Amino acid sequence: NAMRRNEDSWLIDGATPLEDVMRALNIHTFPRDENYETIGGFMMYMLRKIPKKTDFVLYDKYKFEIIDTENFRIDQLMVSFRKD
Amino acid sequence: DSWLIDGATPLEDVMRALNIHTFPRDENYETIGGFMMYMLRKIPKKTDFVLYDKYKFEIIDTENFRIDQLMVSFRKD
Ligand SMILES: [Ca+2]
Ligand SMILES: [Mg+2]
């Protein structure tokens, strides 16, 4: 991708519990089945395809972007407000 | 506050975006990742950082022997 506009964002560990992230972002509508315990797990589901850096999921008010993968998981992601 | 940038971003582009008018160069094409590796001297590891002008440049990821992602923030020293 080209250099991104600097807007408010958070850098988050892919292993952060899903519920913890939803709570902190004030998301009240999300999967409650617990099949994907972590934020990166849920992102991988939503992507369907094999994850790679720069891939992103639009969910609620937000864009969740993979910063890096390691050990076949989303290691770090960035969250910002979505712009669509 | 803090800005996430790709290590492969041309050096001159990042410098100008940050309003840094005085910066190190040689005769080779340079990237922000490249400049940081020059300033670090040591082999790059996540969390390693470079202080230059008003800013801290922190390694967020290394991938393929280069600094892949970095975070820019204001320095505090
Ligand atoms: Ca969080
Ligand atoms: Mg890496």
User: How near does any CA of chain A get to the CA of B61, in Å?
Assistant: 7
Chain B (18-57) residues lying within 8 Å, Cβ to Cβ, of chain A: none
Measured in Å, residue B61 CA sits from the centre of ligand 2 at 5
Strands (E), chain B: 2-6, 49-52, 55-63, 66-74
d(C-alpha B40, C-alpha B52), whole Å = 11
State the ligand closest to the CA atom of A13. Answer: 1
Q: How was this structure determined?
A: X-ray
- Torsion sign, CA atoms A64, B67, B7, B42: positive
Q: Does B4 touch chain A (CB under 8 A)?
A: yes
Task: State which residue of chain B sits closest to A65, comparing Cα positions.
Answer: B4
> What SS3 class is residue A64?
strand
Experimental resolution (Å)? 1.8
Q: Does B69 touch chain A (CB under 8 A)?
A: yes
The pair of structure tokens assigned to A72 is 């076949």
Can you give the CATH number for the domain in which B50 is found? 3.30.465.10
User: How near does any CA of chain A get to the CA of B76, in Å?
Assistant: 20
In chain B, how many domains are there?
1
Confirm if A30 and A36 have CB atoms less than 8 A apart: no
Confirm if B34 and B44 have CB atoms less than 8 A apart: no
Which residue among B1, B4, B17 sits closest to A78, beta carbon to beta carbon? B4
Instruction: Tell me the H-state helices in A14-83.
Output: 18-24, 39-47
Q: Which stretch of DSSP H or E encloses residue B40?
A: helix B32-40
The pair of structure tokens assigned to B76 is 């505090």
The pair of structure tokens assigned to B20 is 């840094």
Q: Which domain holds residue A29?
A: 1-84
